[PDB]
Structure formats: C-alpha cells, structure tokens
Amino acid sequence: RIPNIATYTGTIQGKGEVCIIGNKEGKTRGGELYAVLHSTNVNADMTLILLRNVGGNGWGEIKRNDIDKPLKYEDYYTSGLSWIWKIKNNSSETSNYSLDATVHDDKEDSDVLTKCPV
Numbered sequence: 001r002i003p004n005i006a007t008y009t010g011t012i013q014g015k016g017e018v019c020i021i022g023n024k025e026g027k028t029r030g031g032e033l034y035a036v037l038h039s040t041n042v043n044a045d046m047t048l049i050l051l052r053n054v055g056g057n058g059w060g061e062i063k064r065n066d067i068d069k070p071l072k073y074e075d076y077y078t079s080g081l082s083w084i085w086k087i088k089n090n091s092s093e094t095s096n097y098s099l100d101a102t103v104h105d106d107k108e109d110s111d112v113l114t115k116c117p118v
Contacts, residue, residue: 001026005036008099010113012046012089019051019059019084022112023105030102035085036070038098044068045090046097052083059086059118070100084116 006025012018037048048071050063061083065071071085089095110116 005031005100005102006105007038008097008101008112009038010097011094012087012091012097013094013114014092015089016114017086017088017117018114019086019111019116019118020099020101020113021084021109021116023103023107023109024112025101025103025105027102028104030104031072032076033073033083034070035099035101035103037065037067037085037087038100039067039095040098041091041093041095043091044095046095047086047088047090048099049086049088050083051086052081054082057118059084 002025039046044067046067048065051059051061053059
C-alpha cells in the first residue's frame with residue numbers, strides 16, 4: 001500500500017535516537033541497503049547512520065550519512081547480523097524525518113517509528 005519507497009515519516013522528539021527496522025511496504029523487491037533520510041526545516045541536524053549490532057543491544061556502526069541524503073551500501077554481505085537505520089538528531093525542536101526505504105515487508109519488527117531508544 002505504498003508507491004515506490006516506504007516513506008517512514010514522523011516527528012523526532014528533539015535529539016532523539018531511534019533504530020528503524022519497521023515494516024511499511026509490500027513489494028518483494030527493494031534496495032540493497034538503500035534508504036534516504038529526508039528532512040525539511042532550518043537545520044535538520046539529523047544523522048542517518050547505518051548500524052549493525054546484535055547481542056550487546058548497542059547499535060554502533062560507522063556508515064554515517066547526512067541530511068536529505070540517500071544511503072546505499074554494497075555491504076549486503078554477512079546477512080546474519082542484525083543491521084539498522086539509526087536516526088540521531090541534533091535539532092532542539094521536534095524535527096520532521098522522512099526515511100524513504102525500499103524494503104521487502106514480510107516481518108513484524110518492534111520499531112517502525114520511535115520505540116528503540118539506543
């Protein structure tokens with residue numbers, strides 16, 4: 001029930017920190033590690049960082065992208081490690097975030113907005 005990319009649009013509560021792996025798609029095809037963090041205001045100050053942690057419950061990977069920027073990585077290898085799109089904000093005001101990702105919806109993961117605080 002979504003056009004091309006699954007637009008995860010919401011309001012990040014100030015300097016929020018959230019791990020997005022939520023489902024909001026339907027297509028079988030998508031983008032291998034492809035998601036664009038959209039932000040429209042003064043200074044979005046939003047850090048779209050590609051993370052993968054599994055066991056320590058502390059996301060901390062090095063694939064950082066900027067505001068209004070599509071993140072694509074050819075590192076789709078080792079598909080046995082939990083990876084995430086982490087949104088960390090630096091803006092004081094509740095900023096709008098629009099994470100347009102192309103993923104195959106077939107899961108019922110916990111966080112599709114702001115439930116994963118790490």
